[PDB]
From a paper:
[name] has been reported to prefer unmethylated DNA, and methylation in the CGCG motif significantly reduces its binding affinity to [name]. Our ITC results showed that the mCGCG DNA displayed only a 2-fold weaker binding affinity to the [name] [name] domain than the unmethylated CGCG DNA, and the CGmCG DNA exhibited a similar binding affinity to the unmethylated CGCG DNA. Hence, our binding assay results indicated that the [name] [name] domain was likely a methylation-insensitive DNA binder. To illustrate the molecular mechanism of the [name] [name] domain in recognizing the methylated DNA, we obtained the crystal structure of the [name] [name] domain bound to an mCGCG DNA. Similarly, the C-terminal region after the helix α5 is disordered in the [name]-mCGCG structure. Superposition of the structures of the [name]-CGCG and [name]-mCGCG complexes revealed that these two structures superimposed well with an RMSD of 0.34 Å over their 104 Cα atoms, suggesting that the methylation of the cytosine within the DNA did not cause significant conformational changes. Like the [name]-CGCG structure, the [name] [name] domain interacted with the methylated DNA mainly through its α5 helix. Similarly, in the [name]-mCGCG complex, the side chain of S313 formed a hydrogen bond with the base of T4, and the side chain of R316 formed two hydrogen bonds with the base of G5′ that is complementary with the methylcytosine, while the methyl group of mC was not involved in the [name] binding. In addition to the base interactions, Loop 1 also was involved in the interactions with the backbone of DNA via the residues N269, S271, H276, and K278.
pmcThe [name] ([name], E5R, and NAC1) domain is a ∼100-residue protein domain found in metazoans and viruses, but missing in nematodes and urochordates. There are nine [name] domain–containing transcription factors in the human genome, i.e., [name], BEND2-7, and NAC1/2. The [name] domain-containing transcription factors regulate transcription by recruiting chromatin-modifying factors to specific chromatin regions via their DNA-binding [name] domains. Further structural analysis revealed that although all these [name] domains bind their target DNAs mainly through the insertion of the C-terminal α5 helix into the major groove of DNA, the residues of the α5 helices involved in the base interactions vary from one to another, explaining why they exhibit distinct DNA sequence preference.
Residue numbers in the entry: 208 to 324
DNA sequence: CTCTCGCGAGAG
DNA sequence: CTCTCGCGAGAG
């Protein structure tokens, strides 16, 4: 939320808009790897996921924190940052963000499916 | 691996 | 009953 949280990290979203920006952990070198190879909001979303949540946090959680498996909830502020970074770099819509959330939940489901094996 | 379907439980 | 939502899983 404030840059003092992560010093060597970067900003998710628009740096010059204090209301639509989140400070996160990934280093400026990884943040250029993402904005270079991820040329669609769908690929950027799931690359940001791998780089913002340790995979065994992915294998134990989902977005809302509900469900029959009783998974934990992924950080609502981190998920907000992904929402700003996709809006800022791609100008996604409310329906576009809904599809993205479905992809994120499906990615975390496969991480859960793996963990059992 | 991602994408996306459809099932079935619970909220409304 | 309709809708929302988590889910397993197959296909690409």
């Amino acid at each position: 939320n404030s840059e003092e949280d992560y010093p060597n990290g970067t900003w998710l979203g628009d740096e010059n808009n204090p209301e639509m920006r989140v400070r996160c952990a990934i280093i400026p070198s990884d943040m250029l790897h993402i904005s270079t190879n991820c040329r669609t909001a769908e690929k950027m979303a799931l690359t940001l996921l791998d780089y913002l949540f340790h995979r065994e946090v992915q294998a134990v959680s989902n977005l809302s924190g509900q469900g029959k498996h009783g998974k934990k909830q992924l950080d609502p502020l981190t998920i907000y940052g992904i929402r700003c970074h996709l809006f800022y770099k791609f100008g996604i819509t409310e329906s576009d963000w809904y599809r993205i959330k479905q992809s994120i939940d499906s990615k975390c489901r496969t991480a859960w499916r793996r963990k059992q094996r």
